[PDB]
Ligand binder design. Structure first.
Ligand SMILES: Nc1ccc2c(c1)S(=O)(=O)NC2=O
Ligand SMILES: [Zn+2]
Length: 256
């Protein structure tokens, strides 16, 4: 599986039949269909004690990994019951500034989308959490091209060291608060992982307010490679799944 013609999203259902399931992600967020829920509590993002460890090119995206062996960076509140622990973040992006996000907003595609992945601590570890319908909470943040995001630049600068699949680099003392917009207003709905195995385990929490990154920052994302060292260069671009049918679901908004 990957993102090309021959093994991209339209093919994934053959190995992963859940691809055509009842709660697949991403979706288009139709802002005028979403229901404002005055009872959704504010989101609590508690990243003070976050301990970043490593950055890895996995052949599909790059992942910034965290020490999740204790409650140190956690998401609570909003639509969530209990405490969800940050494990990793990664992005999805385009070959052009006009595409790259997975979620869309009134069919608008952003240049990229950040996903901060958390697991429900009632399930003990990530692997058990993904078997549960409320196992994960993914905080999704859109990226638009404009001004640079200074809190992204440490990431951008290490990409050269992980150009190809399987490469990793120590990535300590990275503060993911630097990647958040000002507002924590959000939409939320029940969905899935957006890559195989496409498990239907996610509560999505998608911020309304995009962050702005520079063109130069996103260009550096686009210099990464899907292939391994020594193989023909296939640029890591357009690593996004397109919108899937909403089916029998409701999107709730935290704001009017
Ligand atoms: N645990 C996860 C593993 C991979 C992915 C996700 C979660 S995502 O945030 O749905 N987008 C993904 O690629
Ligand atoms: Zn993702």
């Amino acid at each position: 599986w990957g993102y090309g013609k021959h093994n991209g999203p339209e093919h994934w259902h053959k190995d992963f039949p859940i691809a055509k399931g009842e709660r697949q992600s991403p979706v288009d967020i139709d802002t005028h269909t979403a229901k404002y829920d005055p009872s959704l509590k504010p989101l609590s993002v508690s990243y003070d004690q976050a301990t970043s460890l490593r950055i890895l090119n996995n052949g599909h995206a790059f992942n910034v990994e965290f020490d999740d062996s204790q409650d140190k960076a956690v998401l609570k509140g909003g639509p969530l019951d209990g405490t969800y622990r940050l494990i990793q973040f990664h992005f999805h992006w385009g070959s052009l500034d006009g595409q790259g996000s997975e979620h869309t907003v009134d069919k608008k595609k952003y240049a990229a989308e950040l996903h901060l992945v958390h697991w429900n601590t009632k399930y003990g570890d990530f692997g058990k959490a993904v078997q549960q319908p409320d196992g994960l909470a993914v905080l999704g943040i859109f990226l638009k091209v404009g001004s640079a995001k200074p809190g992204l630049q440490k990431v951008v600068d290490v990409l050269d060291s992980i150009k190809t699949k399987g490469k990793s680099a120590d990535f300590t003392n990275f503060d993911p608060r630097g990647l958040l917009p000002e507002s924590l207003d959000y939409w939320t709905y029940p969905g899935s992982l957006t890559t195989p195995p496409l498990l239907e385990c996610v509560t999505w929490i998608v911020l309304k307010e995009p962050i702005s990154v520079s063109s130069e920052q996103v260009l550096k994302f686009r210099k990464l490679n899907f292939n391994g060292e020594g193989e023909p260069e296939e640029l890591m671009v357009d690593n996004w799944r397109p919108a899937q049918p909403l089916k029998n679901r409701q999107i709730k908004a935290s704001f009017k």
